[PDB]
Amino acid sequence: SATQSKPTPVKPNYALKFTLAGHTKAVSSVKFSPNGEWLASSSADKLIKIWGAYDGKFEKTISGHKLGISDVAWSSDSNLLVSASDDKTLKIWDVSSGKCLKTLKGHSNYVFCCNFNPQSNLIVSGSFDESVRIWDVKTGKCLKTLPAHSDPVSAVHFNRDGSLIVSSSYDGLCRIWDTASGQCLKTLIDDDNPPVSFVKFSPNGKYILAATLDNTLKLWDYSKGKCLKTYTGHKNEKYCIFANFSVTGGKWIVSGSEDNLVYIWNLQTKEIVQKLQGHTDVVISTACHPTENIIASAALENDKTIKLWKSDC
Template sequence: MQSQQTQSSQNNDSEAARQESASSSSSSKPDFKLRFVLSGHKSSVSSLKFSPDGSLLASAGADKLIKLWNGTTGEFIQTLQGHTEGISDIAWATDGEYLASASDDKTIKIWSMEERSEIKTLVGHTNFVFCVNYNLHSNLLVSGGFDETVRIWDIARGKPLKVLPAHSDPVTAVSFNHDGTLVVSCAMDGLIRIWDAESGQCLKTLVDDDNPICSHVKFTPNSRFVLASTQDSTIRLWNYQTSRCVKTYTGHMNRTYCIPACFVTTPKGKFIVSGSEDHKLYIWDLQTRQVLQVLEGHRDTVLAVAVHPFRNLIASAGMEKDLTVRLWFDE
């Protein structure tokens, strides 16, 4: 009976994964080509994010700076400065009017795109702030850091609503699901946790048998799965409701740094893209898990990757020996 239930659960997982990537199995290969190389950062670029309407690309890094670029031409627009230490992560509000940044100076800053200036600083973390993300309505922010907490902030009041003693090691990624009811976090303790955003209750803990450091985690667009990058050079797609890993993606190199993976949807199909410590980007078919394309050109670890919201465009950025932001198009 137990084996039948297990088999049924596995079948359900497989069917759900197929639904998540319905068009993927008939996909053709992506063909991304380098179009623009953007220079300006003076230290490792740690985070890249396209604005929700795709008009802007924001980059941030260890040089304490945020740079704004045209989201399709790569033309430099402006530099935002105010942090006193390096920036690890940035996140856009849903309407694109605000940008949040998480820094080693233990603060989160909110930047107005209308004024192109800092309008608020959130203080509360007791160590480096490593990750940050908005909810759907952009009234809440979730952050995580080296103080091992996850904090949910009321942005209007500039105060934390919840301080969750979430992990036993630095928190490396946090994100809301599509409707803002759940938060997912991961940490160097190897755990992935799902939280009720309103109550702060931990609903689920996911952990792989080998318990590698978890670098990054995010919900799939339909919020039925989470995609997790771990420092055993593996990316895993988890059905968090059944606590089961349904897909694994390998081929890249990730042993040392927190490298995110992103979803790519083009007319050719659905894919996963990630940077790598061998200076390349890898693109997998979401359904078959095959590596379909490897992008070469960076001269150091590709630490940051972002996908344009509606154009077939990937942005990537490199560490100390590179410092460039590269825009790759599949026309």
């Protein structure tokens, strides 16, 4: 009919815009600055790199860790980074100068994961040493050591007001902790216990998104301790692969995958809505831009690049 019209899209159309080369070993994490201007990457090459979020332009390299870095995270004001390294330390960095402000010492094995609280006065870390540590940003001192897990801690994240921390571990548990006291408020262990390789709070703090090493992501209502959504079809049995809530356009879940693709699901229906092809190794990390429909993806040693993808919705 002459009245036929183009239907409103129900899937995104992410397309490759830039490939970011410079790391010399596997990329381990990518994160967008809260102000939207920058992308930070960490690598097994012991370096952090900063790139422009919209143009993919290399900006600077930040260096000082003695061994590879598994995770990097921004402060709320986009002025600081914290990194987690195999050298058993975290470092706090002034992004503008590239200088190390503090070295956070206390973990007894690799530090795998890190995050600032919303206020950005605290940092949370998780380690192969099975502990979660809470650090004061201004002093660099460890405030609390939580005997959180019985195997390596794969992820740590604060909720939206900082009052809670969620941790995950290869022990098969996710635990929720009261930040102020360090007490465990809940353990999620519904059914059997495959290693949990990633967890984060949803942006409203009412759910947790958790990855397990059986090719499965789950959205849990942890206040009810019930699984609301399951996302499958990707490959994840080996690596601690980040996942994201994409909120700028359509409401998606985004993850890397061991088949070298970026997977995007419809959060509500659980349908795979896009698979982004181009990387030549496992996609270990993805990040979603805070205001624009932009995904960054990063891959392991056969690839060593970060890709920026943009969608109309």
